Amino acid sequence: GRVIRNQRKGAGSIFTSHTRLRQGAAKLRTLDYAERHGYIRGIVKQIVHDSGRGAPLAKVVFRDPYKYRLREEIFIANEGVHTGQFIYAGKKASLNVGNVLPLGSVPEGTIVSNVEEKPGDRGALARASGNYVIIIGHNPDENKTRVRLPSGAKKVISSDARGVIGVIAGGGRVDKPLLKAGRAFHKYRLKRNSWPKTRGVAMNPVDHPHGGGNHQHIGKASTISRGAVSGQKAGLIAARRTGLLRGSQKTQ
Template sequence: MGKRILVQRRGRGGIQFRSKDHLKIAPARYPQDGMDNLMRGVIKEILHEPGRHTPISLVELENGQEFYYIPPEGVYEGQEIQIGKGAEVKTGNVLPLSEIPDGSLVCNVEMRPGDGGKIARRSGTYAIVFSHEGDKVILRLPSRKEKLVDARCRATIGVVAGSGRIEKPFMKAGIKYYHERTHPKRWPVVRGVAMNPVSHPHGGGSHKRPGKPTTVARTAPPGQKVGHIAARKTGRAKRRVATKR
């Protein structure tokens, strides 16, 4: 009789898969104020939130409202920022995409007007305002793909802070362990082919290979749902050679 594999235990839930909410400061979202008018605010504090790879800034608006947002590189405590229509195209300011010129680097871009920011929030990432087409804007995402979004969506001018994070190696497994503890997942991640047959569908055998096709149906039960789930195709694409007629 086999044992419950990791995906089954993760689906059941438990303390080891629970997010450590007591370490969280607050969601980083744009305020609803400033959608149709110009608001000014001051960066009161730049904080570190465990589990978030970017800094987080506390901003106080001129009406007394406070919110947290993801700061770009170059901002500092005490800096005055502008939010909304008519704001200057300056690092740290939040503008609708319709007022940002082509070729600008932006981060924390909204996918829908008023959702608070969804795109390019990771440290060192940014999107490029590629072109304007009426009430739509074409964005070039960090993945180099292009996306069409509403011109009313807001974005922060600049590149997300903390870009040098991936340049420093962990060096020790203990440091990596405490780093991963802030996330609701198990670490280290073990390959299925390195396990015993009772622990994983890919386990066992005299060699480190699955020994069978790794594609699995979308409707498979949790004990089988590992590998390439509902894959349209796997492996390398066949190279087609043109022939002369």
């Protein structure tokens, strides 16, 4: 039979990201002298819409400490930051929405976005519109910090790892119904070519494990093992449970 749809995506032909209009990668400043000893000041020169993104970017310019020139950065904008505002980044820096501080330097309950996984990676976690992470504790010996990510997971990372105070802007985007095919259409038009989706059960056997039969139906359990091999994994992969989730979610 045929190579199924989820196998063809990895070869990246018609499936690569539609990148032309994007403002450029959002990152924190490089972690340098200023940021790990002192603080350094910047101005948000603009806050701007990035294509295929939920949340606005903020263009933030700084002075180059080692050379006379301006150096401009692209930040994900936290809700409430504004044009003309001064941004402070460094180990010793006041605790205010929009500033970037090492996770060690903020008290528990602090709310931060675009937080680094390792120190220096210029931010990894909690970048999507509406999201943040909460600092749930410190271990000053071995200087770690325990945080809770948007997924509900709780991870422990270096207290040197930087984050930015506040939550990411443009929240509530997903509360509004798309209402029609076209709105979805233009949505994925600026992301990648994932839409619309043919059901495997509407296909012929060559095309898909679910394909075929004189009635539409899966024909065997749609829960597939991790051990499964490419061309086998479609449906519910490695599911530990299945069915309507009753009762409260929200991990203890």
